[PDB]
Structures are given as C-alpha cells and as structure tokens.
Amino acid sequence: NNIEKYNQACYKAAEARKKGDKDWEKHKIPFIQNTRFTSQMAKDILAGTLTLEDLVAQGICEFITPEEAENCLVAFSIIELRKHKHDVTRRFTHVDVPQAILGLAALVSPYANCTQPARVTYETDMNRFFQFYNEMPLVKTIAHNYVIPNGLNTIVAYMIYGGYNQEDSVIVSQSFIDRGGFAGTFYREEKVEFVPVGTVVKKGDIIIGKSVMYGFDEPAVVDAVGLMRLRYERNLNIGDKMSSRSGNKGIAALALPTSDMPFTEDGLQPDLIVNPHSHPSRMTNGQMIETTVGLANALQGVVTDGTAFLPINVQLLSERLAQEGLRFNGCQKMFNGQTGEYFDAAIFIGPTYHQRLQKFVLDDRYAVASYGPTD
Amino acid sequence: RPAPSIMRRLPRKEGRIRKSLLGSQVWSISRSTICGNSDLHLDEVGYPISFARTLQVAETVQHYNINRLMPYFLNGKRQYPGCSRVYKQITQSV
Amino acid sequence: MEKIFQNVEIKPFLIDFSNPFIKNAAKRLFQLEEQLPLVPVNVVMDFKGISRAAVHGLSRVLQDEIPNYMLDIKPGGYKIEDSTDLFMTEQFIRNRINFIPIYAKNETLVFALRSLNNSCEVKTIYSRDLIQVAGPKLKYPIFNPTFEIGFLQPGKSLIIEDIYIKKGIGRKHAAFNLAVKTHFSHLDIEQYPTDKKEYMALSGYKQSSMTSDPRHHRLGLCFPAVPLPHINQAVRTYLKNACRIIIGRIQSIQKIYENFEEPQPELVLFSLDEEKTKAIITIKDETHTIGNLLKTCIYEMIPDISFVGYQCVPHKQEMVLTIIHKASQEDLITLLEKSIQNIIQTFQILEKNVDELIA
Amino acid sequence: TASDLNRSMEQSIISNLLNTISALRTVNTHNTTNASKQTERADMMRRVHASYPGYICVAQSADTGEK
Amino acid sequence: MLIPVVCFTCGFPIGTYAAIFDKARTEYIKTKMDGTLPQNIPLDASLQIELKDLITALGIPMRVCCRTHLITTLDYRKYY
Amino acid sequence: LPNKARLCGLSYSGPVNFPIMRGSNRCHTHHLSKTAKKEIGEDPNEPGGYFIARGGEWVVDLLENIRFNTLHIHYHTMQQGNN
Amino acid sequence: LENPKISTFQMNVSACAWYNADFDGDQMNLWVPWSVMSRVEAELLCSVRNWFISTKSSGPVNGQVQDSTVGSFLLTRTNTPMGKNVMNKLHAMGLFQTTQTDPPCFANYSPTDLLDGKSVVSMLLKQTPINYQRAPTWYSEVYAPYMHYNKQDISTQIRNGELIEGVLDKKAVGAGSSGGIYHLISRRYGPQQALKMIFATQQLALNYVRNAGFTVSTADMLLTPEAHQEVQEIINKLLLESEEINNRLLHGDIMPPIGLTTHDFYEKLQLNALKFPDRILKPIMNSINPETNGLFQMVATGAKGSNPNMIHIMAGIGQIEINTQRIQPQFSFGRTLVYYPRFALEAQAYGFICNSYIAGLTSPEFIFGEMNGRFDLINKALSTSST
Ligand SMILES: [Mg+2]
Ligand SMILES: [Zn+2]
C-alpha cells in the first residue's frame, strides 16, 4: 500500500485545518492497497514463461510458515482485496488464492465449497487393479492437471426405480457392465514360494511355485512363471462399491438389461440410478451442480472447470441449460423400460463422474462347512 | 517379552477366558456384503447359490423322510439341490 | 385396410464430407472418401390402433431378446507368445472384438488377426487387419474397417486365430444387442409446453400416466450396422423377425394353455370361492415383454376381469402371470385362448404391413 | 562392508496416482498416537486447528486412509 | 485405453468414427489455437473449444452419452 | 536396476562402505527420462520416492515432531498423582 | 439366489432397522442351523417376527423408510399436479401384482372407472382392520403460513381398515413410529402380520412411484431473485444488530449481569443477536412449489432431511456454534484465523456464514464449517468408545 504517502498527506491536511486555508481536504488522498500481480503475468505462468522462483525473485511473492503466519493479515481472496482497496481500517499483508486451503484429494471434488464434507462422515502389480477405460470428467477441477483421472462419466438418473437403490444402493445397467464399464484385471502373484502360463487355476489345485494349494475359491489364470502370477478378469459385480467424486459411496445392488432400464423420450438411458434420498441429508449439491453443468458440456462438446471456490451462479447454469435446448431444471420426460409408460414427473438425468472403490465383494465373502484346520 | 506363563494365558481380551471360553470360532458359517432387495419379505434373506452349496443341513433318513430325501441323494454334487456326505448308521462312518 | 403400421421413415446416419477436417482425417487414416460399407440406420415408425404394450414389446425385442450375431474368440484362439504385447491382454481385445457390430448372413465364417509391429513407433491395428481365414469368401464386408482393435508397442505382436461368429440374445450378453432407442412418444395425447416453468417439473403430457391409454404411437430405433446398398431390405428382416419372435413366444404360452386338463408343470389353475377361478402360469426365463403383453390382451378381452397381473421378479429369472375370473376352468381357458389369438393376428397383421411400407 | 545392517534397516522400513500422491503427501502423527493413551481423548487432535489453513488440507480424509 | 468400440450407455457404434474423430479434433484445435501456435497449448484452454459441429459432421446423433464418451475418453497412446 | 530388484525379489540396498529410495540421486534412475524408464522397465509416470525391499514396495511417510530449541511449557499435570 | 453372478446377502431395506445396517459396504454373518433341535429353536424362538417390538423401548422397530415413505405419501396424496389423484382399473390392479398377497377383486370396476390412492390402500388394509387417527408429518405449522394445505390431507383417519382421509406419512408408516399403523397391526393381529403388511404397503408405494416418478433436481434448491433479495435483507438486518451491539461494547455501554464477565455477556449477546428470524422460511417457501419439489417433499414427509437442512441449502448457513459458543480465538492471542485482524468486531470473524451451500461458501466460511464437522465426528467416535 501507500500508507507512508497517506500518512504524510494526513499531516499536511491537519496543518491546513489549523490555518485558514479551508481546503485541507485537497491534501487528503485516498488509501490504496493492491497486489502487484497482473493479468499479463498470470497468462505467462500458464504459457510457462514465468515460474514461482521468478515470482519470488521479484517482490510479488514470498513464503510464509505457520510461525510467520502470526505476523500476517491475509485477504482470503482477490475479491476481498479489491473490496477493501481504499479501506484504511483493514490493511492486508498478503492475498491468497482460496483454492490453496485444499489438497489434491480434496481438490478433485468439483464445487466442493457448495458441499460440506462434514456431513460426509468417514471415521471409526500385487493386489493392484488395472481398469481399461478411463475418461476425463466433463466437469474437471484443477487437480486433474496433475493426476490421471480414474472413473467414467456415467449417465445417472436421480429417481426412485423399484426401491433397489435405497439406503445408498445403486441400480447399474447390465449392458454398461458388459461393455467394459469399470472393468479390469485383478493381479495377484505368489512371489516367493511349475504350471503352464495361461492355465485355469481352480480351487483346490496344485500350482508348484518357487505354494501348491489354491483355495481362493475364484478361478484364476497363470499370468507368468517373483513368479507364478495369477490374474482375474474382474468386471463390475453386484456388491461392488462405487462413489462420486463428492463422497457418496454406494453399493451396486441390482443390474438390469438395456430393455429394463428407463429411457427418455430422446432415447437416453442411465448407467446408474441413484436414489434422491442420498442427497438431502448428505447434501452433495456439488453432484447435482456437476450433473447440470455436464449436460450442457456434453451437448456443446466442451470440458469446463469446476474447481472449488471459483465463482458460481446456479441460476446462470440453469439458463445455460435452457439455451442449449433442454429444460431449465435439466429434467426430461422418462419412460418405464419395463412397462413402457411415461413417468408423470420429469426425471433429472445427466452425466456424473463415478469411480469404483478398490474393495471388491468377491475378496471378502467367505463360507466354511463343518470341517477344516483346528487349533 | 519372552514370558510364556501358565497364568499369563488367562487374563486380557486375548486370554483364555475371554477369547476361548467366552466366545468361540465356529464352523458352518458364512460372511458377505449385504444389499437391498425389494422383492424379499421382511423375514427373508437372499442367499447365494454357492454358499447354499457350501453350507449343509443334516437330515436323518427315516420312513417319512426317504421319499423327500431321495432327489437330494441322486443329485449329489452335480445339480442343485444336492448333497455332500452321508453317514451310515451301521458303519459309524461318513 | 386400416394398417396398424401406417408410416415409416428410414434415415441412415452418414458422414458429412463437406466438413474439411473430417474429410482430411478420413482420407489420410483410411483412404476413405465415401460412406462406409455399413452405416447406422434410424427408423422412425408410427403405429395406430395398437396397445402401448405391443409396441413397447416390439421395441424391447428389437433392443434385445432378438437373436443376433457377434464375433467371439474361441478358447485357445488368443496365442500367447514371446512377442505378445503385455498391454493388449486377452480380456481387453476380446471385449473390443465382441462389441464390433457385424451384419453376417452365414455363420460359418472364421477370421484371424496376425499383426506384428517392427517400426519404432507404436502401431495401431484396425478392423481392416482382420482377415477371413475360413468360410465362403465375403462379397461384401460384414463390419466397417475403421474400428481400432488396439495398439502394439514397438517390437510386439498380437495373434488371434479363431474368431468365429457366435449367436445369442442381447438380454444374456450386451454384445448381442441389436437396436438403440432414439424416440418414443404418444401422438394420441396432447402436451403442455415444458418451457413455461409451470410445467417444467412435469412429463409434459396432459393426461396422467395412470389413466391414459394411448393407441397412436411413434417409435424410433437405430440399428448399428446395415449394408448401405440394401438398407430397406435389412430393416424389413429386422422388423419381420421381431414379430416372429413375439409370435413364437405367445404360441408357446398358447400350447401350455391348450394343454390344460392334462398335468402341466407351468399351468396351475384351481377354482376358489366356487365362482372364481385362479390361473397361475410360470414360464422360466420369460421377460416383461410377454408378461406385459399377455396382461394387456386378457384385460382387453375380459373388461370385467376380477384380477390379472404378472411379476417378473429380477432374482427369480421367471415370469408368473396370475388370472382370476368368475367362470369355470374350461370357460376361462377359452377366453384366454381367444386373447392369445388376438395378439397373433395383431402381429401377423403387423408383419405383413412391414412388406407394404418398407418397400 | 557390513551386510547385516540391511536386514534391520528393511525391517524398520516395513515397520492409483491419487492414492500414490495422497500416501506420500500424508503426514502421519504416529508419535502422538503412541501418546494417545488408548485413545483417551486422542481424537481431540483430529479437529481442524486454526493454524491449518494453507498448510494442512482442511477437508476430511473421507475414509481414503486408515479408519 | 482407447475410445470404446460402442457407447457404454447405448451401444451405439461410436468406435467406427473414433480414429477419424481424434485426428479431426486435433486438427480443429490446432486451427483454432493457431493464433498463438506454441508447441503445446494449455489443456484448460484447449478443452474449451466447442466440438458439437465437428461431432455432428461425423454422423453421431445428438445423444448426451455418446458425445460424452467420445470426447471425454482418455487415449492411452497419448499419455503413454 | 530397480525393476530387476522388484521382479527378482532382491533388495535394492547399496554397498555399505542401506536401502536406496527410488528417484534418489543415489539410485541409478536419477536424471533418467520417460523413454528410458520405460525401456529399463519402470513406469514413466511414477515419481519414485519409495524403498524396494523384501519383494514389495515400501514408502516412508512424512513424520511431524515437536519443534526443537523451543520451550514447550505444558501445564498438563500427572493424572496418577497431583505431585 | 440361483443366479451365479449374485454374491451378496440380500435383505429388505425395512429389515435394516433390526441390525442397524446400511448398504454402504457393511458385512454380516450368516449360518444355517443343521441340527433338528437348533432348527426348531431358530424357527420358533429367534424369528425376527419376535424382534418387531423393541425390548429397549417397547415401540416398533421396522416400517417404511425413504422411497416407501415418499411413495406412501404420493399414493395417498389427494391431488396431483395433473389433477385428482386417480388411476384406472389396469393400474390399480398393477399396484397389487407384486404384494405377494391374495389380490383383491376388481370385478365391479369397469376399465374406465377411476380409483383414488386412498381406495387402493384401503383395499390392501382390509386384511388387518385397524383404527387410526393422527395428524401426518405433512401438516406442519412451520409451513402453514406460506403454503396451501388441502383439507383432506391435514388429518389422517383410518376407520376399520379404510383410509377415510389424510396422507400416509412417516407419522403413520415410518420406522419406529409408536402408534403407527404397523404398531396397531402387530398389537391386534401379531408381529408376523405386521411384517407382511409392511411388505405389502412398501410394494404398493413402490409400484405407484413406478408411474408417478419421483426425482430431485438442482433447480429444486434455487431461490427466486425476490427470495434472494429477502434473504439478503434478513442477513443484513442481523449484521446491523450485531454492529449495534459492537458499538455498545465500543462505548463501554455493556453492563454484564451478576455472575457473568463482560466477555461472556458480550459473547452471549452477540450469539443471541446472530440468529435467523424464523422468517427466513418465507422466501424459501415462496420460491419452491410444494406439489412438485422433490427435496421439499422428502423433507416434509419425514423421509429424509430436515428444515435446517433446507435453510442451509437455500437461504444461508448462519452462525457456526461449537459447544454452544462461537469460534474461540485460537490462531493467535486475539485472532481466530489468519484472514482477520487481532481484535475483530465483525461477526464474520467468529463463525458467521452469510452464504448458502447452493450459493457457495468462501474460504473462511468453509474452514468454520469443517471445524464444526470435525467436532461432530470426534464426539461420535469418543461416545462409542466410552460406551
Ligand atoms: Mg454401512
Ligand atoms: Zn449413447
């Protein structure tokens, strides 16, 4: 800021008050606090010309530790710094980008500030999954410039369909599973401690390794002979757990053929059917905003940015939907795939990024029968 | 640390009394994830076929039982419903 | 006279080569400057004087439950060798090959994929790389040559020797799906303007779904692959075949019905109340197509029916149709037999109407 | 050159991309868990402290790590 | 690892046009960004270019799912 | 090479005139390139930073500790006895 | 489940009340008795029918939840946006085609006849005639000023098994609803009949929703610009009151009562000043349409959510309170966060959020919300551990 000039003019104005000038105000000057960051420099950073080291080299930036933080008054965003540009009551030492208060794991979720992870309550190649198909989210955050996204934009319908999606359950479509959605190979090798490579390793069989017994109960295949690698062709199974970027973990409770899934008057049908009762208490409004934005993004064939703390106006997004040709609220006319009758209410359906959590049903199921090893 | 004691086995949550006598590991039991199913009554549970094949129910052959139990015996382990073992009363062997 | 299938419209999805970028890419990647041998076809059909159940059942059959063909690798076809690429696993390639749409007339065709990469760069293997090892020579392609089967890292290879033509129904496996829904509406019922924001949260129809009984429908289905020279003939066969499938299933139910008075595992009819007669029909592996269709005909044939309904529980893999009526067992069967005949005539009329229009 | 050290060292050591990044960027307070005294009001520290903003991510882990 | 042979949601054969679409999209983005024409334009800016008309030219209908899977899907060849 | 240690189950420990964290200046992978890492047998996108031993990968997490040369005046008393 | 693909235990959602379970990855143990004595004991003694009435509280344990509650309300709803809530004979029959019960006789209804949801619910309830009269969760004095209530919906009355009027709601069919219809069915005909009636009513509700589709949209959480102006005016009024108290403190006009220090009295006074006027509900109800708003219907039927939830989503979060107190300064001697001066009088510095979840919180508001959430989670964990 220019407080030294502000103060100096302040003294001069007061002296004129003692005098008969009566124009003391002319000496007073407005206070000014403004960062030296410039729109041009921001462009250079994206172009790669200007780096942080160069920013620190000039007086634009400097590092502040939690100790030195106690000597700093920071404007939470450029909006606040501008709002108090001429305010002498509140002088800021630094200005920060509001996204800085989140890590990559949190920054993955779009429109995070529109949700509270607080109500999202969570407290209390070996074994590695390789998923064939991954796609960039329609509403990407900044985090996806540094991590390769995993998951798929799955058309999700927020509706009550037979009651198989209650209590955080999900109704997947069998065709979506068959086509390769969330499908991959599960790898597990004996490692320390033969058989032909590519051999069906059934339960209770002998696989000599350098470990003959095999009792996993799920057929495997000899991938290699650190040797004796077994690979499983793992698809999406009833009981597998999927979750949206904003928490919202759900278990696949039912799979339906393409003929039984609901469809819109335009032929669009969902991959997932999420129960609307998941939203109210958990308040993942970011999921709804992502769906609304993604509808327009898909229709226009663009990928927009949904990083948290960026300015958001839901009314304008709905108006964008209306311009694109859909309804203002984004709902469509849907038909019951089983009876072919239209729902009396429009159904909110659109893309929503989903990923499968690495906890598989077949891994933890178990059954035993009245005999076996004993202590 | 290397203190194997007769009396050290009794106390604590992992001791004899609390882990062995009060509570026990058991056979003929299954564990799995749960899911919703609107077509199952309140007092019903949907059981996978493979688990129904692993776990068994013991029936004592008798004059009233024989006809109903014959299909299970004939199916064996080839087609569900079937069976896994039979205990002969004369030979006292399974 | 009074064609149930009144108006049809066939509109293939074509590549617009006026666009410079599409034209440049196609001419460079595949030396392609014209429409592909096989193209998707969107068929919009209008039906009049037919129940919604029949039209939706036809749509369901065309989507799946209609026998279709796919390319599958026989066990042991995927040859595991030293040069085999690690990324191009058998599951991935199997999925890709399975879900390629094909239009095959002869099932005794076998294809092989022998691709080797010697260049330093990564090589992409397209569907044109598939070759016909066995079977009668193909006068016309059965699939487009533009699909990306995969890519081989430099110095790697991929050999698959037994790629035969499998048969099935889309319901059991998605690779056998035949039709893609594109439109479904009832021209009988009026509609609100749904841009007004007073009806924005409604379906748009002016009649509640629980009272409306539409009889004039427009149905739109898209078929993935169809030979460009013979679009019209292919649509005839597809539409005709679905009618045949529905007629066959209904005729099996009719066989069960007529075989009453003789022990039948499926049909279980017993008189209750001395005036009513229940009739439960359980058919394994039947779907909503026949259950919904069978409910509608009986309801139309017996307006004063005590009760009729069905339940295709997803975890039972069977269809149970329940019928209760005030009549003797013999009289009830005659009414039900008559109801079945009405569908068969309706779909027989529908089948002939196809030949009149699609031509 | 002594090789017996390697055994103890690797024993001490043992003692997708989002997962890899989160695991490495994680800051484990194990010394404090040892002082938890059987979780005797130990959770009190899992709270968000006013010093965290800008240094320690303030959003919840969401079961991505340990229970 | 590649654009799916068929749309995951419909089964519509978007895989027929996948390679042509990829090449055409690359050319289209290059033409639009020629105003600057570095070696590599920022990804954020690149993805904001509308591809609706480009996709329509190929023949894919105006289906939300098909276009979603066509544009969003990652190509394992580029990332490597 | 790091993959050989992983694939063969051998520890990546260096000669003691000690496990070497991958991506370290002590490891051979230092200053390597994406094309080379693929040729050697590594994933180009992996940032290293974890120890290879016992056939399984191990990564040491950051550990926080009380500051040093600072007087931490803890008012906490002893619960066992108010001594 | 003879389908080889299914590999999970499956139970009716209404059964989760017994086990306190949710389909979020929870696992359960199952063992089949194989000895005659054990089988007899299991079937005659440990049947879940016995656990219908809680031993702890003597009230019901099971009932309709989520989709079943909403569908019961919709089915029994007297008027729909299309018009009167009626269905033809075909759909009335189709409602009962999965209840696994002896279907009722429709021989007296022509195909063109129109039946209301109350009629079909009564048809189902004649198996277990009960008497019941109570106000539903739908009718709330909180909403009465700002919305129109149909006379036939405000009061629920079941007479000898016939639903004379009103809407079945969480108050009537909800899980754990003492005096609900299932409670009376169990008390008069046995716990086993109660479970069967729960299943049948759930099937009716789901079958109805099969046609009267139900959804929640993003536009259901959007305030009309006039409502946004009203909310901003209310927030500004609260801030003005807070600033008046701040001026009082500045001039030293704050006189604490006996027993409270000036600081505690000031904190209590500011906390009371910063509280939503209960008129904040007016702009919310003005913008939303009760007949077709999914979120509002879910909240009002008791199926899920609460009024504070809607207020936070649409109007504004308000004052964050931890241990019934504002954000005590902990960043530094006087500071609460790095973004505020040492001795700040503004309410924004002590945990007042003027934004709404739909509007999007700023960084400090987000930090305060997360502080509150972490507090809640910590309390839950410590409570269970101590118990
Ligand atoms: Mg749970
Ligand atoms: Zn599609």
Alpha helices in chain A (DSSP H): 3-18, 24-27, 39-47, 52-57, 78-83, 104-107, 174-179, 279-282, 285-300, 314-324, 361-364
Q: Are A92 and A75 in contact (CB under 8 A)?
A: yes
Which run of H or of E encompasses A256?
A: strand A249-256
Angle at G127 between CA G124 and CA G133, to 5 degrees: 75
Closest ligand to residue A153's CA:
2
Beta strands across the sheet bearing C276-284: C267-272, C276-284, C318-326, C307-311
Chain B residue numbers touching C316 (CB-CB < 8 A): 39
> DSSP assignment of B8-41, as one string?
GGSSSTTSIIIIIISS---SS-EEEEEEE-TTS-
- Between the alpha carbon of residue A117 and those of residues A56, A113, A169, A286, the distances in Å are 34, 9, 20, 11
- Between the alpha carbon of residue F2 and those of residues A188, A294, C89, F6, F13, the distances in Å are 20, 43, 25, 6, 10
E65 is an annotated ligand-binding site residue: yes
Helix (H, G, I), strand (E, B) or coil at F43: coil
- C-alpha G91, offset from chain centre: 29
Phi–psi pair at C72, nearest 5 degrees: -135, 150
C109 C-alpha vs ligand 2 centroid, how far in Å? Answer: 30
Nearest C-alpha neighbor of B28 from the set A198, G32, A223: G32
Nearest C-alpha neighbor of G11 from the set B35, C94, A310, A18: B35
* Local structure of residue C125 (DSSP, 8 states): E
E45 is an annotated ligand-binding site residue: no
3-state per-residue secondary structure call for chain G: CCCCCCCCEEECHHHHHHHCCCCCCCEEEECCCCCHHHHHHHHHCCCHHHHHECCCCCCECCCECCHHHHHHHHHHCCECCCCECEEEHHHHHHHCCCCCCCCCCCCCCCCCCEEEHHHHHHHHHCCCCCCEEECCCCCCCCCHHHCCCCHHHHCEEEECCEEEECCCCHHHHECCCCCCHHHHHHHHHCHHHHHHHHHHHHHHHHHHHHHCCCCCCHHHHCCCHHHHHHHHHHHHHHHHHHHHHHHHHHHCCCCCCCCCCHHHHHHHHHHHHCCCCCCCHHHHHHHCCCCCCHHHHHHHCCCCCCHHHHHHHHHCCEECCECCECCCCCCCCCCCCCCCCCCCCCHHHHCEECCCCCCCCCHHHHHHHHHHHHHHHHHHHHHHHHC
Method: cryo-EM
G41 C-alpha vs ligand 1 centroid, how far in Å? Answer: 30
Is there a contact between E63 and A148 if contact means CB atoms under 8 Å apart?
A: no
Phi–psi pair at C319, nearest 5 degrees: -120, 125
Which run of H or of E encompasses F5?
A: helix F2-8
Structure tokens at B18: 């609390």
Interhelix angle for G191-211 vs G181-189, to 10°?
A: 140
* φ/ψ bin of G176: left (φ > 0), alpha (ψ from -120 to 50), beta (otherwise): left
Is there a contact between E8 and A138 if contact means CB atoms under 8 Å apart?
A: no
Nearest C-alpha neighbor of C48 from the set C356, C350, C352: C350
Alpha carbons A68 and A91: distance in angstroms, whole number: 17
Which run of H or of E encompasses A273?
A: strand A272-274
Nearest-CB residue to G23 (from A168, A317, A334): A168
Q: Are C311 and C317 in contact (CB under 8 A)?
A: no
Alpha carbons E12 and A175: distance in angstroms, whole number: 12
Helix (H, G, I), strand (E, B) or coil at A246: coil
Alpha carbons G133 and G137: distance in angstroms, whole number: 13
Nearest C-alpha neighbor of D36 from the set G328, A120, G385: G385
Separation of first and last alpha carbons in chain F: 59
CA dihedral E53→E54→E59→E65, nearest 10 degrees, is -80
Nearest C-alpha neighbor of G204 from the set A163, A342, A273: A163
Q: Are G113 and C210 in contact (CB under 8 A)?
A: no
Alpha carbons B84 and B77: distance in angstroms, whole number: 6
Interhelix angle for C288-301 vs C52-63, to 10°?
A: 160
Task: Compute the nearest-CA separation of F49 from chain D (Å).
Answer: 8
Phi–psi pair at B25, nearest 5 degrees: -75, 140
> Any CB–CB contact under 8 A between B46 and chain G?
yes
Instruction: Find all residues with CB under 8 Å of A204, minimum gap 6, and list them.
Output: A213, A214, A215
Task: Compute the nearest-CA separation of G123 from chain B (Å).
Answer: 20
Helix (H, G, I), strand (E, B) or coil at C250: helix
Alpha carbons G158 and G165: distance in angstroms, whole number: 7
CB atoms inside a 10 Å sphere around CB B69: 16
Give the bridge partners for C205, in sequence order.
Answer: C191
Chain A residue numbers touching E44 (CB-CB < 8 A): 46, 145, 305
- Between the alpha carbon of residue A370 and those of residues A373, B26, C136, E53, G41, the distances in Å are 10, 8, 58, 66, 20
Alpha carbons C96 and C130: distance in angstroms, whole number: 13
Nearest C-alpha neighbor of E80 from the set G64, C151, C345: C151
- Between the alpha carbon of residue E57 and those of residues A268, E20, G33, the distances in Å are 21, 11, 66
Phi–psi pair at C309, nearest 5 degrees: -170, 170
Instruction: Find all residues with CB under 8 Å of B62, minimum gap 6, and list them.
Output: none
Alpha helices in chain C (DSSP H): 20-29, 52-63, 90-98, 231-258, 288-301, 329-358
CB atoms inside a 10 Å sphere around CB C286: 22
Sign of CA dihedral B37, B41, B47, B53: negative
3-state per-residue secondary structure call for A337-356: CCCCCECCECEEEEEEEEEE
- C-alpha A333, offset from chain centre: 28
Q: Are C254 and C335 in contact (CB under 8 A)?
A: no
Closest ligand to residue G16's CA:
1
Phi–psi pair at G373, nearest 5 degrees: -65, -45
Structure tokens at B79: 């087609």
Across C66-104, b (16+ Cβ under 10 Å) vs e yields bebbbbbbeeebbbeeeebbeebbbbbbbbbbbbbbbbb
Q: Are A330 and A209 in contact (CB under 8 A)?
A: no
Q: Are D26 and D65 in contact (CB under 8 A)?
A: yes
* Local structure of residue A258 (DSSP, 8 states): T
Nearest C-alpha neighbor of A294 from the set A357, A348, A236: A348
Q: Are A241 and A151 in contact (CB under 8 A)?
A: no
- Between the alpha carbon of residue G371 and those of residues A67, A270, C66, E18, the distances in Å are 21, 37, 58, 48
Helix (H, G, I), strand (E, B) or coil at F20: coil
Alpha carbons G24 and G33: distance in angstroms, whole number: 28
Interhelix angle for C288-301 vs C231-258, to 10°?
A: 70
Strands (E), D20-66: 27-28
* Local structure of residue C94 (DSSP, 8 states): H
Burial of F24 (0-12, 13-18, 19+ CB in 10 A): middle
Alpha carbons C201 and A224: distance in angstroms, whole number: 57
Alpha carbons G226 and E33: distance in angstroms, whole number: 43
Strands B30-36 and A200-201 come out as unpaired
Q: Are G345 and G326 in contact (CB under 8 A)?
A: no
Helix (H, G, I), strand (E, B) or coil at F52: strand
Using the structure block, give the residue that is written with the tokens 């407080």.
A3
Alpha carbons C246 and C351: distance in angstroms, whole number: 11
- C-alpha A194, offset from chain centre: 45
CB atoms inside a 10 Å sphere around CB D61: 17
Q: Are A185 and A158 in contact (CB under 8 A)?
A: no
Alpha carbons A154 and A337: distance in angstroms, whole number: 18
B57 C-alpha vs ligand 1 centroid, how far in Å? Answer: 31
Nearest C-alpha neighbor of G368 from the set G347, G353, G354: G353
Is there a contact between G81 and C307 if contact means CB atoms under 8 Å apart?
A: no
Is there a contact between B54 and A367 if contact means CB atoms under 8 Å apart?
A: yes
- Between the alpha carbon of residue E2 and those of residues A297, E43, E76, F79, G23, the distances in Å are 21, 19, 6, 63, 33
- By C-alpha distance, the chain F residue nearest E79 is F45
Instruction: Find all residues with CB under 8 Å of G247, minimum gap 6, and list them.
Output: none
Alpha carbons G221 and G217: distance in angstroms, whole number: 8
Nearest C-alpha neighbor of D22 from the set F21, A107, G377: A107
- Between the alpha carbon of residue C124 and those of residues A74, C88, C115, C121, C147, the distances in Å are 54, 11, 10, 10, 10
In total, chain F counts a number of residues equal to 83
Chain B residue numbers touching G7 (CB-CB < 8 A): 32, 48, 50
Separation of first and last alpha carbons in chain G: 39
Q: Are C330 and C293 in contact (CB under 8 A)?
A: no
Which run of H or of E encompasses C79?
A: strand C78-79
Q: Which of D8, D13, D56 to probe by mutation at the F interface, max F CB count within 10 Å? A: D13
Helix (H, G, I), strand (E, B) or coil at C280: strand
E65 C-alpha vs ligand 2 centroid, how far in Å? Answer: 4
B63 C-alpha vs ligand 1 centroid, how far in Å? Answer: 48
